[PDB]
Design a protein around this ligand. Sequence first.
Ligand SMILES: *[C@@H]1O[C@H](CO)[C@@H](O)[C@H](O)[C@H]1NC(C)=O
Ligand SMILES: *[C@@H]1O[C@H](CO)[C@@H](O)[C@H](O)[C@H]1NC(C)=O
Ligand SMILES: *[C@@H]1O[C@H](CO)[C@@H](O)[C@H](O)[C@H]1NC(C)=O
Length: 148
Amino acid sequence: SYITPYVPMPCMINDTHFLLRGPFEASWAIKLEITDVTTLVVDTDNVANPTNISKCFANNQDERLLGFTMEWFLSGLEHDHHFTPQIICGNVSKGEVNAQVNITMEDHCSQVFLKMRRIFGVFKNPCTSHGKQNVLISVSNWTNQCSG
Ligand SMILES: *[C@@H]1O[C@H](CO)[C@@H](O)[C@H](O)[C@H]1NC(C)=O
Ligand SMILES: *[C@@H]1O[C@H](CO)[C@@H](O)[C@H](O)[C@H]1NC(C)=O
Ligand SMILES: *[C@@H]1O[C@H](CO)[C@@H](O)[C@H](O)[C@H]1NC(C)=O
């Protein structure tokens, strides 16, 4: 049973904003935001899937460590043939988020919520809404947003 070293430090800000500080006290954190606002639309070459979501971080510094950390975050999810949310990569050079994960479908939403509750603890279930819903994934600077 393999124990990855690339485990981030979780930091829940509130029901919609979450941070995963990079392993080994990195100066960055992966930012997750639950929102019903859609910022990315599918074009001919920005679509990804859970297995290669790492490619949505190719233009980032520390790309390898970012991939290992996203691999940790999606454990149990990318292994699931039925976890098939639409994922779109954003243009980070134009200020867009790294990835937009479509969680409008209830089964996908709830699978993500259950994983996030396991990592962060209890928060408001976002899946009881109807209408479009997303998780936006980006990279923020770590400024000690959580401490003891
Ligand atoms: C959650 O936190 C983010 C930034 O930390 C803020 O933009 C948002 O308004 C907060 N939400 C609530 C319900 O306080
Ligand atoms: C997300 O999925 C829903 C239904 O599956 C769809 O209506 C919506 O257009 C999708 N979002 C994007 C950005 O395509
Ligand atoms: C991820 O893989 C799919 C299918 O293999 C491919 O169509 C898509 O271009 C890949 N995404 C990126 C960002 O390379």
